[PDB]
Amino acid sequence: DVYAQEKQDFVQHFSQIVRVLTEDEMGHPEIGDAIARLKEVLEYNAIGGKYNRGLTVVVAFRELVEPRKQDADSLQRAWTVGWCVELLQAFFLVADDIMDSSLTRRGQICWYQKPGVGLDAINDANLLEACIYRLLKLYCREQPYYLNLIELFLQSSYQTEIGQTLDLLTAPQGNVDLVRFTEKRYKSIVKYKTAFYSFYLPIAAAMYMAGIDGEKEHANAKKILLEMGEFFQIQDDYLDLFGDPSVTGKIGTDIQDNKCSWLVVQCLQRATPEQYQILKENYGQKEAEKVARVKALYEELDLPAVFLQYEEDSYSHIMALIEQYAAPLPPAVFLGLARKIYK
Amino acid sequence: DVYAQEKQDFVQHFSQIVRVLTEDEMGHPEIGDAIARLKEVLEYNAIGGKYNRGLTVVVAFRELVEPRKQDADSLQRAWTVGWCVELLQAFFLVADDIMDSSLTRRGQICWYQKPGVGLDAINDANLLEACIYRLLKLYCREQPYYLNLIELFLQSSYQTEIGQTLDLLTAPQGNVDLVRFTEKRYKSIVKYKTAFYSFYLPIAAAMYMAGIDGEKEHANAKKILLEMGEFFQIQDDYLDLFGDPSVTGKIGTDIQDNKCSWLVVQCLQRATPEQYQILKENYGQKEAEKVARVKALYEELDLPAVFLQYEEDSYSHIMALIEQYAAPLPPAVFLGLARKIYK
Numbered sequence: 017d018v019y020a021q022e023k024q025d026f027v028q029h030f031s032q033i034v035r036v037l038t039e040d041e042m043g044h045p046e047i048g049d050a051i052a053r054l055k056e057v058l059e060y061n062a063i064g065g066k067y068n069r070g071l072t073v074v075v076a077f078r079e080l081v082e083p084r085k086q087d088a089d090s091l092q093r094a095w096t097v098g099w100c101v102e103l104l105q106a107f108f109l110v111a112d113d114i115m116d117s118s119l120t121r122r123g124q125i126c127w128y129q130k131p132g133v134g135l136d137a138i139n140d141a142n143l144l145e146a147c148i149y150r151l152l153k154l155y156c157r158e159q160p161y162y163l164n165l166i167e168l169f170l171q172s173s174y175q176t177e178i179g180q181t182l183d184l185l186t187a188p189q190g191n192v193d194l195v196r197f198t199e200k201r202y203k204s205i206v207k208y209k210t211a212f213y214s215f216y217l218p219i220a221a222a223m224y225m226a227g228i229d230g231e232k233e234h235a236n237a238k239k240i241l242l243e244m245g246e247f248f249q250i251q252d253d254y255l256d257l258f259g260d261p262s263v264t265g266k267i268g269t270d271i272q273d274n275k276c277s278w279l280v281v282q283c284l285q286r287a288t289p290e291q292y293q294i295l296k297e298n299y300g301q302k303e304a305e306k307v308a309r310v311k312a313l314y315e316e317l318d319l320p321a322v323f324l325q326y327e328e329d330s331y332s333h334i335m336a337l338i339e340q341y342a343a344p345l346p347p348a349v350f351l352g353l354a355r356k357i358y359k
Numbered sequence: 360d361v362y363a364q365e366k367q368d369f370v371q372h373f374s375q376i377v378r379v380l381t382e383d384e385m386g387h388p389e390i391g392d393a394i395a396r397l398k399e400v401l402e403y404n405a406i407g408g409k410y411n412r413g414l415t416v417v418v419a420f421r422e423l424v425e426p427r428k429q430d431a432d433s434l435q436r437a438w439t440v441g442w443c444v445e446l447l448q449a450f451f452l453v454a455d456d457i458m459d460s461s462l463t464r465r466g467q468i469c470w471y472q473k474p475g476v477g478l479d480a481i482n483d484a485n486l487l488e489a490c491i492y493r494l495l496k497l498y499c500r501e502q503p504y505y506l507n508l509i510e511l512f513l514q515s516s517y518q519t520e521i522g523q524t525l526d527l528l529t530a531p532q533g534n535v536d537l538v539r540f541t542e543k544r545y546k547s548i549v550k551y552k553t554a555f556y557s558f559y560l561p562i563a564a565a566m567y568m569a570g571i572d573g574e575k576e577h578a579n580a581k582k583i584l585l586e587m588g589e590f591f592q593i594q595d596d597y598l599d600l601f602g603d604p605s606v607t608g609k610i611g612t613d614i615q616d617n618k619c620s621w622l623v624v625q626c627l628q629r630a631t632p633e634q635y636q637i638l639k640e641n642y643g644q645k646e647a648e649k650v651a652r653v654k655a656l657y658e659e660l661d662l663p664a665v666f667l668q669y670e671e672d673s674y675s676h677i678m679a680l681i682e683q684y685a686a687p688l689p690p691a692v693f694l695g696l697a698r699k700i701y702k
């Protein structure tokens with residue numbers, strides 16, 4: 017497994033990331049304390065996930081750059097850009113945990129819930145974002161792809177924030193939202209909030225690094241990668257309720273938070289008028305027994321079996337798209353990523 | 360007054376800003392609702408201030424570009440970059456109001472306190488930031504200063520966030536912070552959190568637009584502008600307690616929030632050991648009568664008279680720096696800005 021090959025080296029590069037985001041400022045002692053808080057934020061929030069998004073940059077970089085061109089410094093730029101994707105994820109999750117009222121993430125208490133943090137985490141999150149652009153500058157400023165990468169990271173943030181905005185608008189707290197939970201809406205939300213940054217962004221970064229900047233090549237990749245990202249979010253929604261928390265590292269809140277989850281969309285498609293009422297009376301509320309009634313309804317409509325069927329169909333579909341749109345890129349780029357997310 | 364001259368035109372340009380941040384996406388109807396929320400965020404949070412930071416870009420642009428070079432399109436790029444500074448301010452204040460537990464801003468209830476907003480304002484704030492880079496791209500992508508401006512806005516966010524981090528670390532909630540409130544610390548905080556973005560950023564943007572990109576020219580400007588920004592923050596601290604709220608548009612929270620304010624630093628420099636105890640027992644707490652005891656202590660040490668003296672000295676100092684460091688730039692660039700902030 018090519019991801020598992022490259023993991024140790026990727027993670028080991030983190031202490032260099034952190035040294036450089038501190039060595040950058042030994043000329044300014046007055047900001048010493050702030051830099052120490054930054055280190056602590058990086059350590060708590062950039063570590064402990066699966067690193068799939070960041071590793072995708074590195075794996076794809078290997079497969080796209082001719083190996084005589086993979087010198088020490090280029091590899092280091094690749095690992096650094098991979099870490100920039102992980103920093104963007106860390107930015108997003110720290111903020112999302114506050115907005116979703118979350119408890120745990122990656123198996124530990126959410127950063128904002130730590131005593132002494134609280135809403136200061138808003139600034140913490142934005143420092144994570146700022147780190148991306150400081151790394152790009154320190155490591156890629158003289159490369160012909162520098163501007164492409166900056167604009168890709170910015171554009172990806174914007175798309176993700178537009179996605180989040182739709183996610184929030186579709187889920188107002190304390191209000192019966194069932195009319196709004198449709199398939200068309202669901203697919204838009206997830207395209208913008210997850211698919212661009214989690215799937216297009218890292219492969220696109222590696223494309224740009226390898227000097228593949230053509231509009232058609234990017235557009236072809238993107239047809240594959242946005243569909244994979246949609247499946248990824250549906251799986252994330254399913255696991256929010258049916259996953260095992262010692263594996264997912266987090267406790268699901270989608271029903272309480274009134275979310276336009278794939279599950280609730282599937283539910284609505286199938287429920288009898290009576291079941292529609294159960295959903296209505298119980299969805300989007302804090303009360304544990306209300307949450308449980310919803311979950312029972314989902315199990316009564318074999319939504320877990322529906323998810324298992326959908327996963328097999330989506331896998332066939334994604335593979336068909338790799339057949340249609342991968343060339344001229346190595347199909348292994350996309351296949352290694354599909355292996356990481358299916359089963 | 361050159362600021363007052365250019366104001367009407369600046370403000371009128373806002374509806375174009377908003378049209379372009381919406382016309383940009385008529386090819387993507389699925390995100391329609393999100394774009395409507397964006398418009399609403401822009402309207403509530405980018406409007407109602409004094410526009411000094413954004414206007415500084417435009418005023419400075421006029422004074423630095425030779426007028427035969429001030430065509431219709433260049434002016435429009437100037438007003439747009441001015442609006443990018445105002446968007447950055449709007450980003451910062453929306454987030455800062457949540458973190459400082461604020462009530463009002465610019466004479467209306469803070470965005471996050473509106474019913475139905477709450478911590479969704481975190482995403483709202485970040486959309487404001489994203490707008491900057493979308494405007495730079497749409498209006499300045501083909502200009503030789505494009506990258507300079509992107510890197511200046513990013514670097515300015517980073518510095519401001521580092522400043523904020525020091526502000527928060529120096530003011531932990533529910534803890535007696537008096538030992539940490541020193542002059543040296545105070546000056547660092549304000550340099551980073553306010554001075555870079557409020558004073559260096561807008562003049563630097565206009566410098567870059569006029570093709571003045573030299574390291575020494577930027578460094579000279581910056582010596583002037585960071586000192587002005589320090590005075591600006593001290594005045595902001597003074598007004599937090601002693602300003603009239605129908606003028607400031609906001610209610611001050613520095614004493615409750617346990618802030619390393621210029622006032623508390625001045626207080627510590629002057630208090631008898633007994634007064635030091637009053638401060639200690641009353642600073643940083645929610646209780647209205649505790650706040651009032653602190654204010655009475657400040658008045659007992661004639662801190663308002665100390666501020667009035669300091670303002671006159673700082674004004675003389677800034678003017679001396681304009682004499683030393685303005686050339687080769689027109690001194691009117693800096694003088695018009697000092698007129699806007701002193702008295």
Ligand SMILES: O=P(O)(O)C(Nc1cncc(-c2ccc(OC3CC3)cc2)c1)P(=O)(O)O
Pocket residue numbers: 107108109111112116176177180209210252253256481482485
């Ligand atoms: O990991 P999670 O299950 O919590 C997913 N988290 C996730 C997925 N896709 C995008 C985000 C995200 C990104 C930025 C956000 O706001 C910050 C920009 C200000 C909020 C959420 C967060 P979700 O809440 O959508 O099920």
Ligand SMILES: O=P(O)(O)C(Nc1cncc(-c2ccc(OC3CC3)cc2)c1)P(=O)(O)O
Pocket residue numbers: 138139142450451452454455459519520523552553595596599
């Ligand atoms: O307008 P205010 O009196 O409230 C001043 N506001 C202000 C001045 N300088 C910088 C900020 C600022 C910028 C960004 C912030 O956090 C966002 C980056 C995430 C928080 C505060 C806010 P302050 O709270 O320092 O007296």
Ligand SMILES: [Mg+2]
Pocket residue numbers: 112113116118
């Ligand atoms: Mg979440």
Ligand SMILES: [Mg+2]
Pocket residue numbers: 112116183
């Ligand atoms: Mg979420």
Ligand SMILES: [Mg+2]
Pocket residue numbers: 252253256
């Ligand atoms: Mg989820």
Ligand SMILES: [Mg+2]
Pocket residue numbers: 455456459461
């Ligand atoms: Mg404030």
Ligand SMILES: [Mg+2]
Pocket residue numbers: 455459526
């Ligand atoms: Mg503040």
Ligand SMILES: [Mg+2]
Pocket residue numbers: 595596599
């Ligand atoms: Mg203030």
